[PDB]
Write a protein that binds this DNA or RNA. Structure first.
Ligand SMILES: [K+]
Ligand SMILES: [K+]
Ligand SMILES: [K+]
Ligand SMILES: [Mg+2]
Ligand SMILES: [Mg+2]
Ligand SMILES: [Mg+2]
Ligand SMILES: [Mg+2]
Ligand SMILES: [Mg+2]
Ligand SMILES: [Mg+2]
Ligand SMILES: [Mg+2]
Ligand SMILES: [Mg+2]
Ligand SMILES: [Mg+2]
Ligand SMILES: [Mg+2]
Ligand SMILES: [Mg+2]
Ligand SMILES: [Mg+2]
Ligand SMILES: [Mg+2]
Ligand SMILES: [Mg+2]
Ligand SMILES: [Mg+2]
Ligand SMILES: [Mg+2]
Ligand SMILES: [Mg+2]
Ligand SMILES: [Mg+2]
Ligand SMILES: [Mg+2]
Ligand SMILES: [Mg+2]
Ligand SMILES: [Mg+2]
Ligand SMILES: [Mg+2]
Ligand SMILES: [Mg+2]
Ligand SMILES: [Mg+2]
Ligand SMILES: [Mg+2]
Ligand SMILES: [Mg+2]
Ligand SMILES: [Mg+2]
Ligand SMILES: [Mg+2]
Ligand SMILES: [Mg+2]
Ligand SMILES: [Mg+2]
Ligand SMILES: [Mg+2]
Ligand SMILES: [Mg+2]
Ligand SMILES: [Mg+2]
Ligand SMILES: [Mg+2]
Ligand SMILES: [Mg+2]
Ligand SMILES: [Mg+2]
Ligand code: NA
Ligand code: NA
Ligand code: NA
Ligand code: NA
Ligand code: NA
Lengths: 50, 101, 118
RNA sequence: CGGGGAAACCCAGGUGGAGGCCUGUAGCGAUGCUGACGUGCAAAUCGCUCGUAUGAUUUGGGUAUCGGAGCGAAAGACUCA
RNA sequence: GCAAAGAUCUAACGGAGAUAUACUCAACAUGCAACGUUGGAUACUGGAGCGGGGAAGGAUUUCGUGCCAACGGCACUCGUACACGAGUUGUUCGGAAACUGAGCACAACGUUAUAUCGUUUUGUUAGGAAAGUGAAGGAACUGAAAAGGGGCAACAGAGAACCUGGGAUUAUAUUCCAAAAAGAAAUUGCAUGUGGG
RNA sequence: CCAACUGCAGACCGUACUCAUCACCGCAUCAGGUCCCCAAGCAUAGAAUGCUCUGGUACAUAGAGAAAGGUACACUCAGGGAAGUCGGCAAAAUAGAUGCGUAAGUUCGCAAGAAGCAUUGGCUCUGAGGGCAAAAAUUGCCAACUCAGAACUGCUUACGGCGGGGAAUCCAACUGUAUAAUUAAAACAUAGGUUUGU
RNA sequence: GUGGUAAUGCGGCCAGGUAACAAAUCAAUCCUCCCACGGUGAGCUUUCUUUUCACCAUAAUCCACCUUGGGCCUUUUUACUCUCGCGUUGUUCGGAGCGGGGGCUCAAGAUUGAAAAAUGCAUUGUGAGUUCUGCGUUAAAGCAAAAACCUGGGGU
RNA sequence: UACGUCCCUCUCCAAACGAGAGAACAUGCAUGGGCUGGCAUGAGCGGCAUGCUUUCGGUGGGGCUCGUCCCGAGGCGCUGAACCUUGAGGCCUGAAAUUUCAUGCUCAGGGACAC
């Protein structure tokens, strides 16, 4: 709904900002072990419940 | 070729449901070129998009039946389903008559 | 309403009449005749026959007068007629002649009509 | 308000809308089919049928009382399957 | 087995999704089945709505473009999927500043080996000295009277000055619009003049 | 002095979208559950039920297609009519409105819609029931539907929706409550009565 | 400060008031629906159809000031003399002042105009719903409070 | 190699699907017509008239206008009419008939086995 405390809104904003895939140049690096973000979140799979 | 965006914008602009918005089956490139509300307004001005009239719900049958009822038809014993007080409350008749007197 | 209606009374209907009569309705056929007609006489005959007065087709008396002056058509009556009625009669005419798909009719002003094209 | 009556009072017709009153929606329940389903739509649901529906009624939010305990119109019911 | 909630049909367009062929073979009998959009047809919801808005809950699912590996228990050219790029505008709307309620419990005091316990609105804390400033009077320094400390708890109670038009969006709007504010108001807090009796 | 102007300034946070047969909870886009506002036309007593303009939708895997045997918010059935069965379970049946009529029993309130009998269509008419104005017991204009009564004319008894009824026995006075997920009852509650402590 | 016989009109502290409150009935504001009439557009038109469908709108905030209902003033008050009168659909009311005449006041609406056509879309009358509002029975049930604000009583 | 068989196709005495009975340019199929049957008198129009029937016969309780012409359930006439009649699949193109069937579609069947 409309209401949320600004702090909850900021936590949700940070979670949105984190829900991004890995840049590919990260995969080109010398000792790289990461290929997928593995902490990706879909709003329908798992809840944050803020 | 999907004209969903243009149909949505036209429904918003014309103030009507989707069923009354008419998108010319010919002239589909010209409609697809319209990505803004301004260009959809221009399509509406050129006749490419038209608000269609509402469907007819006619009261003519009911008016004819109302004339018949006013002459006194269709209101006999076999016709009435509610109680007499439901059809004509006794309190309303009493209030009318006492106010008259 | 005040008096109960009868079916026999529906047999003959009487049309209300105004105070200062000679009310005029004009159709303007300038545009269709400007194009390529002997159809103004057709329209006048149609209005002389198929116009209803007191519920009867024809027999207008002095009350309803139809004249065709200068490529248009004037209708002058002392009865409470609606303009939409003569528009309805015109649309029936154009539905007979097959012109209705081509000739349209609009209120060019207060009391008059005009035949336009598409 | 009409009629009787010595009186006390009696006999009518209207008005008015009372009730943990009745029929019946929504709502709140859940009688029967011992129906459906019974590796289900569902770890209790579905259909028809059924109880009640101005009240000791139903419901949102807030608030108070718990594990040797709380709460209970009392079924050892319920206290996040 | 994928059977409740009645249902789709037709053409054109789009699409790799076709009218897809060894010989013979005119076409049937050798490329089936399925798509999204628009138009038309047919039907359903039937205002206690597969309508239009809110709380709780969710938190980008919204919007545009693109793309169909996986996911949408059939399918997809489609998607609440995936990728990229955007989007939420307030003196007056809701809250808070700023009310009280059922209640809560900081302080105080008491208790407890232990405060992580109790009391704390039946006008009201605490053996309990809990008030810190209107004034004056010669610019901020001094001080009367006033009994019962400080908070919190309602986004449906109390309270609260704005509302129409817009050709104004891809998506927000009683929030945006620019001097002809499309405009019309109301209301705070300070200051400036006119006038007062 | 301060009551009408006028001048400047009006800070913070929320605001997308959803609110559900796909956006919440139920491991899931689950026939379950989830508070509030606006709520149209005709039939009709109507927020019953059926159909419809506006808005919304054609989304639920589909195509072909008379095996048996199923399930059904699907029917019918000669003659008999509960002989079936533990038991009329299921189904059938009754039905609206109006007039008439209505027993035992009774706490006088009821029992009662007791039971029963009859009528309702369609058309064409007639009567009654009003408001405004200038023996006004009259003169004009006018609106909303109802109820009653006739003549004529039909029925294949024909949408939906809508009690079956009676005579008794046991128990509990009654309305309520109650084993979420096998028990709704005669159990609990209840008013009323009695006792106890103070 | 001031006018009206009056109802009432106008330019520290103390005590009241608003906030502030269950139900029904009957009238109802907007608004919704319907009907009548009249415009504008559309649809049907083999045949009929003076037809069928759609539309005809006016926000806040201000100025002026034609009804309904409540409270009240003043005046007549042999008003209730032996059937008192007034009034509701309804359970009433009156010398503790009914009714009539003339006024004061409050609450709902009207009407006039400013806004406002410069906007909007392609019209002016009736009947049914509708609780804003008006009218200030169950009870061994009698149906919150405070801030803030308002007015007076005293005093400057 | 050849006869041939099956699938595609068509019919229905068969039939859940296989299988069966059949046909293979065949009145085979399609559409008409007639028959046989079902229902019960269509739409439209009209009231002594250019209508119906073969000289006959031709409404309506009421109601409304100015004797006429209008509204009016229902009735009468044209009219045992209109419609339906083979389809999960009636008859007739081969007895006779006041009539007893007419038309048109097919234009080298295709495929696989036999091999
Ligand atoms: K969870
Ligand atoms: K079948
Ligand atoms: K059947
Ligand atoms: Mg949250
Ligand atoms: Mg009564
Ligand atoms: Mg009851
Ligand atoms: Mg069972
Ligand atoms: Mg036990
Ligand atoms: Mg299977
Ligand atoms: Mg429908
Ligand atoms: Mg809804
Ligand atoms: Mg799939
Ligand atoms: Mg995503
Ligand atoms: Mg408190
Ligand atoms: Mg608070
Ligand atoms: Mg606010
Ligand atoms: Mg929004
Ligand atoms: Mg909702
Ligand atoms: Mg209904
Ligand atoms: Mg309903
Ligand atoms: Mg679905
Ligand atoms: Mg399914
Ligand atoms: Mg039988
Ligand atoms: Mg029988
Ligand atoms: Mg037996
Ligand atoms: Mg036996
Ligand atoms: Mg039974
Ligand atoms: Mg008796
Ligand atoms: Mg009995
Ligand atoms: Mg009876
Ligand atoms: Mg009992
Ligand atoms: Mg008991
Ligand atoms: Mg007993
Ligand atoms: Mg009860
Ligand atoms: Mg009970
Ligand atoms: Mg149980
Ligand atoms: Mg008991
Ligand atoms: Mg077959
Ligand atoms: Mg022969
Ligand atoms: Na919400
Ligand atoms: Na009944
Ligand atoms: Na299936
Ligand atoms: Na983003
Ligand atoms: Na669901």
């Amino acid at each position: 709904g409309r209401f949320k405390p600004l702090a909850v809104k900021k936590k949700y904003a940070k979670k949105m900002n984190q829900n991004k895939p890995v840049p590919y140049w990260i995969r080109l690096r010398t000792g790289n072990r990461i290929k997928w973000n593995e902490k990706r979140r879909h709003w329908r799979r798992t809840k944050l419940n803020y | 070729v999907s004209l969903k965006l243009q149909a949505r914008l036209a429904s918003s602009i014309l103030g009507c449901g989707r069923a009354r918005v008419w998108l010319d089956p010919n002239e589909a490139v010209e409609i697809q070129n319209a990505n803004s509300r301004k260009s959809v307004r221009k399509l509406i001005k050129d006749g490419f998009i038209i608000r269609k009239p509402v469907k007819v719900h006619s009261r003519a049958r009911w008016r004819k039946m109302k004339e018949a009822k006013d002459m006194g038809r269709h209101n006999g014993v076999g016709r009435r389903e509610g109680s007499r007080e439901a059809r004509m409350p006794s309190k309303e008749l009493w209030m009318r008559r006492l106010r008259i007197l | 309403v005040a008096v109960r209606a009868k079916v026999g009374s529906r047999s003959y209907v009487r049309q209300k009449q105004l105070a200062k009569g000679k009310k005029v309705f004009k159709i303007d056929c300038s545009i269709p005749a400007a194009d390529g007609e002997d159809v103004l006489g057709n329209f006048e005959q149609f209005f002389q026959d198929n116009t209803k007065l007191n519920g009867r087709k024809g027999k207008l008396s002095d009350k309803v007068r139809l004249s065709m002056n200068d490529n248009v058509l004037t209708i002058s009556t002392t009865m409470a007629y609606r303009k939409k009625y003569f528009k309805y009669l015109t649309k029936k005419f154009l539905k007979k002649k097959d012109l209705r798909d081509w000739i349209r009719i609009l209120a060019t002003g207060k009391g008059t009509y005009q035949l336009k094209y598409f």
